[PDB]
């Protein structure tokens, strides 16, 4: 079934970010609740189509890794995307409730994000593009999923920053990066979810101590690219989770680790046996 705009009707707001604002909606028809994303672009109707037309390939993209589809349209200065509303939010949100993620649920969560980003590449030769803790969402069910990714080409041209980049040194470098930058990306989220908050720069030997000004733009990115990379802090987190994370963020994408290497690493292989009740860990923690 086609989807449109006065087929809809606001419930709340989910949230909103750099570009695009995202709504908790009903859609009267199905009866369905879904998660609109609106995104503002003063574009030509030719492109606007070609936008629309290239996001239907979301259609195609299932996976229990992956958030689901319901349509894409263009309304009034905005082209939405619609899909299923992940009740639990983006790991961005249950880490400000949680403070730290633990160990044992960052490794369930590693474990979806590889399957995602290993499906949206086996099945669809589409990178992420943007991998950080707000574009992993959960839900009740217990599942992890992944969305905000990079569909469609045009889109992508025509959004062409902020005070925190998940951004692999070669793509701040330049034009020169592809699927290993989605590795680091998802080597900094989960160090920051692992210790409550974004890891550059590193914290001081006494912040340490104590869980156990806000940087300028260039500062920081000059940090990102020509300092030593991020490491989970010794002794509280598995060896294994240490070296997991240092295969993620190495700084050249060619010694870096790949998904088919970390698919395999000795901290997936332990999570993927462990019994972890996420969606009770997730409730509890809301
Ligand atoms: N499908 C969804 N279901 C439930 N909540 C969602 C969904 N999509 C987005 N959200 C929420 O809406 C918030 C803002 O979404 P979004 O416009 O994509 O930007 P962001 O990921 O927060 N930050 P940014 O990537 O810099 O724009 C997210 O943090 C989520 O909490
Ligand atoms: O959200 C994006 N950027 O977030 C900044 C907004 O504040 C985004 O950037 C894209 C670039 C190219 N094609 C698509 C998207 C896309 N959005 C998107 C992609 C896939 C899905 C899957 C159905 C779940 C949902 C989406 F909302
Ligand atoms: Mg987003």
Redesign the pocket.
């Known amino acids: 079934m086609e989807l449109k705009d006065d087929d809809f009707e606001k419930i709340s707001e989910?949230?909103?970010?750099?570009?695009?604002?995202?709504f908790?909606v009903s859609h009267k028809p199905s009866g369905l609740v879904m998660?609109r994303?609106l995104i503002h672009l003063e574009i030509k109707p030719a492109i606007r189509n070609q936008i629309i037309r290239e996001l239907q390939v979301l259609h195609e993209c299932n996976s229990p890794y992956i958030?689901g589809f319901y349509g894409a349209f263009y309304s009034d200065g905005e082209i939405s995307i619609c899909?299923?509303?992940?009740?639990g939010?983006?790991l961005?949100?249950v880490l400000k409730k949680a403070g730290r993620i633990p160990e044992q649920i960052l490794g369930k969560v590693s474990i979806a994000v590889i399957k995602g980003l290993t499906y949206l590449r086996e099945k669809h030769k589409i990178m992420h593009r943007?991998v950080?803790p707000?574009?992993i969402?959960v839900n009740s069910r217990g599942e992890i999923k992944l969305?905000?990714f990079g569909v469609s080409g045009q889109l992508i041209d025509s959004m062409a920053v902020?005070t925190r980049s998940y951004m692999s040194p070669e793509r701040l470098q330049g034009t020169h990066y592809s699927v290993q930058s989605d590795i680091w990306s998802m080597g900094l989220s989960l160090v920051e979810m692992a210790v409550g908050r974004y890891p550059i720069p590193p914290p001081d030997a006494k912040e340490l101590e104590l869980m156990f000004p806000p940087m300028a733009i260039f500062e920081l990115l000059d940090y990102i690219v020509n300092e030593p990379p991020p490491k989970l802090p010794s002794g509280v987190f598995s060896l294994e989770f240490q070296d997991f994370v240092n295969k993620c963020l190495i700084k050249n994408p060619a010694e870096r680790a790949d998904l088919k290497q970390l698919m395999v690493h000795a901290f997936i292989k332990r999570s993927d046996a462990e019994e972890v009740d996420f969606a009770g860990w997730l409730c509890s923690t809301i």
């Open positions: 989910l949230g909103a970010g750099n570009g695009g604002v995202v908790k998660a994303k958030v899909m299923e509303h992940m009740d939010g983006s961005d949100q943007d950080k707000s574009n969402l969305c905000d902020g």
